[PDB]
Design a protein around this ligand. Sequence first.
Ligand code: FES
Ligand SMILES: [Mg+2]
Ligand SMILES: [Mg+2]
Ligand SMILES: [Mg+2]
Ligand SMILES: [Mg+2]
Ligand SMILES: [Mg+2]
Ligand SMILES: [Mg+2]
Lengths: 96, 98, 133, 137, 86
Amino acid sequence: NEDLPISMENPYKEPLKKCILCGKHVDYKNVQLLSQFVSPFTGCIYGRHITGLCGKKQKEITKAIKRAQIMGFMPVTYKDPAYLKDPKVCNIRYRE
Amino acid sequence: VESFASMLRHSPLTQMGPAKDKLVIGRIFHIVENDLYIDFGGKFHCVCRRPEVDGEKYQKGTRVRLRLLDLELTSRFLGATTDTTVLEANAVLLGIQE
Amino acid sequence: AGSRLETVGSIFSRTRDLVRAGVLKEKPLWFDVYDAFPPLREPVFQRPRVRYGKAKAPIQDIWYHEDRIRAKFYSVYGSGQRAFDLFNPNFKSTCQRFVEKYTELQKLGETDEEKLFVETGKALLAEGVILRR
Amino acid sequence: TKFSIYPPIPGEESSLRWAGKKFEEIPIAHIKASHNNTQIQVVSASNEPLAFASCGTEGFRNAKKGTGIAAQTAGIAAAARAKQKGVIHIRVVVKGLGPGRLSAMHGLIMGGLEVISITDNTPIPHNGCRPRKARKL
Amino acid sequence: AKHLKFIARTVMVQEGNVESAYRTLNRILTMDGLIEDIKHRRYYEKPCRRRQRESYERCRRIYNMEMARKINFLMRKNRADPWQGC
RNA sequence: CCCCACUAUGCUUAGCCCUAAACCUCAACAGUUAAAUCAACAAAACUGCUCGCCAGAACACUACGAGCCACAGCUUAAAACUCAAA
Ligand code: FES
Ligand SMILES: [Mg+2]
Ligand SMILES: [Mg+2]
Ligand SMILES: [Mg+2]
Ligand SMILES: [Mg+2]
Ligand SMILES: [Mg+2]
Ligand SMILES: [Mg+2]
């Protein structure tokens, strides 16, 4: 009989979801990108429940932010005002 | 003599593939106030709210267009060894089948 | 009256044993019918088990060759604007027409999936069915 | 023009003005709201102390000193002494989470000064010194 | 101390609405965790107590999320009875 | 217990001391999920193999001996009297 099902991997398998930064290089010198994941008012680094990043890229962003802050590329206690008008990628609203 | 394997292979439900975001025709078979129970040929019916636009046309036997999301709504919860089912399909009511 | 130990044996074995032992004076009405036409499995109680380790359910996923084609279709031409009618036992979707034409082109021609895809699309458009990518 | 909740940047030229002066020229009201006292000092943009008033300098003593009414009185008096020096607009900078954090600002507004911006400067160490042990009450 | 002033934790007032600006500042300081940090730093929290507290809060959040998901999933069945009488 | 002040100590360097609810209170490797699942609770139930340890309570994280940079210390660790329980 030819009608029997055949062993096979799911062809309808949807691709696994990817974070916004997947495949992209995160550099401590790219302060513009790093500033998109810190609080505008306190400079505190957002958690992954806000940034939506995967664990690997969350760690990469955290390390890059600390490196840039200590090496004299990024402010610590606030987000640099030059980057306040960049696209908002974090799921947080201060009702400001 | 057609075997069960051939029936399953050439069945429309088998041919449809994944049920997510598929347009189907359903038939209203029961109405409870503003809740319409619709069969679209699956194991379970789907229950939809009567639209506010031309709501009077939705009567028993009426043919409607649905966008399927799930053939059956199930989910496993904390501390359970088996899924919990509501015995209902998930669908979006689009309109009447002209 | 018979034993109420529903987890020991089955109703048939219990009734047969008690009839043989003299506890039951007469066989119940269903005993002869059961004995002449038994079920495929004797209804003995069993406690269902949770599986662990490498033990896996032996149920296989149902896949057919044309599913691959269907997948490509639903990713390229998207879900057909025409709606499915599952009540019709012989309903034929646009994807099913594409699958049939693909299989015919495969059987009357060569085996290169991409060429089969484009040839099938051309043939269906020639037939006169709209297929927006 | 959409109101910007963020302050102007001293570098970037902006059009916001208050009595013809820029943001970086307005006097600053530094409020220190401790747990038992509230101290308000008005200084210029060039750090010239204009007025100073706390809950202690206004006669309140001991536990009455760390109250909202005491902070309101201190704010009113600081606003008066600053009004006697040509201050109408101020930028507020609060430090501490004491009871008079808002009452002192209320007093400053009620004394005649206009508040254009609020800033928080409460000290938050990123784990510097070790605090004292919790009370066994 | 070494940073530029009047940028961090600074709110502008709109049309003299001082109270709205102050409440927005309170909202920001609470959402960024600074209020909780200041309140927790008044006295020293022992490392073991800190670890226990964080574990408890994480597990409580997870459990509450799961319970909320369960109730939201079972709220679909909550409607008018369709087979009244039988 | 609350408030204030201030030591040994918490730190660095070089040596000691060798103790913890040093706990996942689960010994290491390999395998199984079929059985009757299974005293109970903890943390689903077991199998093969190896090492370590345990044979009523208390006396006893004790005495003596031995070893130790330790000298009010650590490791190892009893017996007599007593009880019908623990
Ligand atoms: S999802 Fe791939 S790097 Fe984040
Ligand atoms: Mg000292
Ligand atoms: Mg433990
Ligand atoms: Mg070992
Ligand atoms: Mg000891
Ligand atoms: Mg000795
Ligand atoms: Mg000893």
